């Protein structure tokens, strides 16, 4: 299926045939017929394409896609080169500077270099109408991403979930705490970041957790 | 709509870069008041003043303005209930 990496399709295939997903697709088609929707159709499932499903080592959850021109490209927090890092990403990058020695602001906000190493950058909602935050909520995506998160909780082991802000804590509340590692913090948004996101050291702690499986760490620096 | 709301309040014509949903409890201590329901934290950067400028609204589809926060480099806030 178009735009969806095959190791992902194989495993999630039941979902696509389900009424709710089919009704999601034609909601999205309708939206595109009449408005601009972000990200572009061919980048909605970018996260399925940067790595294989077996190779996922870390999960970072997001909400919905940036709603400005050229920002979203189907990975949570990341922006298409050369868009400036949004305010939350600025704070993510601030945390990396003090958490990961040698980390250097890469001079862009494209996080694909993480995704290619097994960092699943998953928004819970996958599309948005231009200029309208949260405008595609409860149209089916929540249900589908719940399906993706379940599948990873059930079928993989030792995956580190980094959950930022309460909505993301919520979305990860059923992750099997025996088979996986969940780390929680408040959102990197400027409203909250100096209130627990800065100093959370999630990126090194993740690599500390990976090392217990004899799993090779994420090189957070390769952006 | 929303950047006009920012302009009226602060005289700055700015571009919202992101909108983050937060629980009432998530926003309460920072703001010193609890909103009736979820809030979207809509954030622009004012490059002139090196300030993060946040317009908190209710969720889509209403986006009713709740509060405006102006944050400096070290994260100190100036808060105005709307």
Automatic annotation (TrEMBL), chain A:
It comes from the Eukaryota. It catalyses: a 2'-deoxyuridine in double-stranded DNA + H2O = a 2'-deoxyribose 5'-monophosphate in double-stranded DNA + uracil; a 2'-deoxyuridine in single-stranded DNA + H2O = a 2'-deoxyribose 5'-monophosphate in single-stranded DNA + uracil; Hydrolyzes single-stranded DNA or mismatched double-stranded DNA and polynucleotides, releasing free uracil. Residues 49-210 form the Uracil-DNA glycosylase-like domain. Its EC number is 3.2.2.27. It is found in: Mitochondrion; Nucleus. It is an enzyme of class 3 (hydrolase). GO terms for biological process: base-excision repair, AP site formation via deaminated base removal. One of its GO terms (cellular component) is nucleoplasm. Excises uracil residues from the DNA which can arise as a result of misincorporation of dUMP residues by DNA polymerase or due to deamination of cytosine. Belongs to the uracil-DNA glycosylase (UDG) superfamily. UNG family. Interacts with RPA2 subunit of the RPA trimer; this interaction mediates UNG2 recruitment to RPA-coated single-stranded DNA at stalled replication forks. Interacts with PCNA; this interaction mediates UNG2 recruitment to S-phase replication foci. Interacts (via N-terminus) with FAM72A. This is Uracil-DNA glycosylase. It comes from Gadus morhua (Atlantic cod). The gene is UNG. The chain holds residues 82 to 301 of 301 of the full protein.
